[PDB]
Design a protein around this ligand. Sequence first.
Ligand SMILES: Nc1nc(Nc2ccc(S(N)(=O)=O)cc2)nn1C(=O)Nc1ccc(-c2ccc(OCc3ccccc3)c(C(=O)O)c2)cc1
Length: 273
Amino acid sequence: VFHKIRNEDLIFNESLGQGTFTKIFKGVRREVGDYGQLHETEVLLKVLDKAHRNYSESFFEAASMMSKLSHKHLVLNYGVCVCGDENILVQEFVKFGSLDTYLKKNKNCINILWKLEVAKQLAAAMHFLEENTLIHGNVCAKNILLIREEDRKTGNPPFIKLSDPGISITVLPKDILQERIPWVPPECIENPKNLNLATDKWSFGTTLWEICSGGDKPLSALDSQRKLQFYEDRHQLPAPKAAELANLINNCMDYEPDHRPSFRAIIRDLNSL
Ligand SMILES: Nc1nc(Nc2ccc(S(N)(=O)=O)cc2)nn1C(=O)Nc1ccc(-c2ccc(OCc3ccccc3)c(C(=O)O)c2)cc1
C-alpha cells in the first residue's frame, strides 16, 4: 500500500489545472530523506474528493498497481495524503509538465527525430506494461511527462515518463468516454467492459498522432455525436503534416483489437524508420 503522508508536511501552491473529478496543484513536501537530512521537495498533488468514493477507489487502485512496477519510464508516486476531506496522490514534480501543452508551445522547434525518440520511449514503457499484462487505459499526450528537454549541444535526447492511469473508463460516465474519442477505442465505446491490453495499442496510436501534430487534438472540431459517427463509419485519422509515423498510427488504430500489433513489433517498426 502507499506510504501515508501527513497534511502538516504538505504545502499547497499554484493550481496546475483540472482533470475529470481531480484537481492538480504544485506543492512542497517536508520530509526526512537519506542520512536523516531534512528536505523540502517540490511535489505534484493530484486531489480527489472523498465523496466520490468509486472514482477515488478506481484512481488510487490504478496508481497503486502501476507503482508496484518500478521502471525508469513510469512516474514516481511518493505516497498518499488522507488527513482531511480529500484523497491526495503525492507525486514527483516533473520540470516541464505534460507533453500536449509542451508540444503546442514548441511546435515550431521540434523536428522528426525529437518525435521519433519520444515515440520509442513511450513504446518502451508500454512494452514493459504489456509484458506485465498491466492495462494503463488512459494513454494520451497529456499523460506523458517530460523529465528533461533535448540538449541541443551534447546530443542528449529528451526523456519522458508515463503518468498514473487515473480513473478507469469502466467507471466513468459514458458521456466523458464519448468526449474522449478517439483516445478511447471503438470497442470500449460499444462497451467499457471491453477494456483490454489492446486498448492501449489504439490509444498509443492516437498519442503518436498528437506527438506528430504539434499537440493538436484529433477530431476536436467534432462534437460528441459526430465523434461517435466517426467510429460508426470506420474512419481513420488524417496523416499528420509530419507524416513519417502515419502508417504506424493507422496500424495501431485498427478497429479489430486482435489485429493491433504488439509493442515489441511497434518498437521494431519504430527502429526501422
Ligand atoms: N507529475 C507532474 N509533474 C508536473 N509538472 C509540471 C511542470 C510545469 C507545468 S506548466 N505547463 O504549467 O509550466 C505543469 C506541470 N505535472 N505532472 C503531472 O502529473 N501533470 C498531469 C496533469 C494532468 C494529467 C491528466 C492526464 C489525463 C487525464 O484524463 C485522461 C484522459 C485520457 C484521454 C483523453 C483525455 C483525458 C487527466 C484527468 O482528466 O484526470 C489528467 C496528467 C498529468
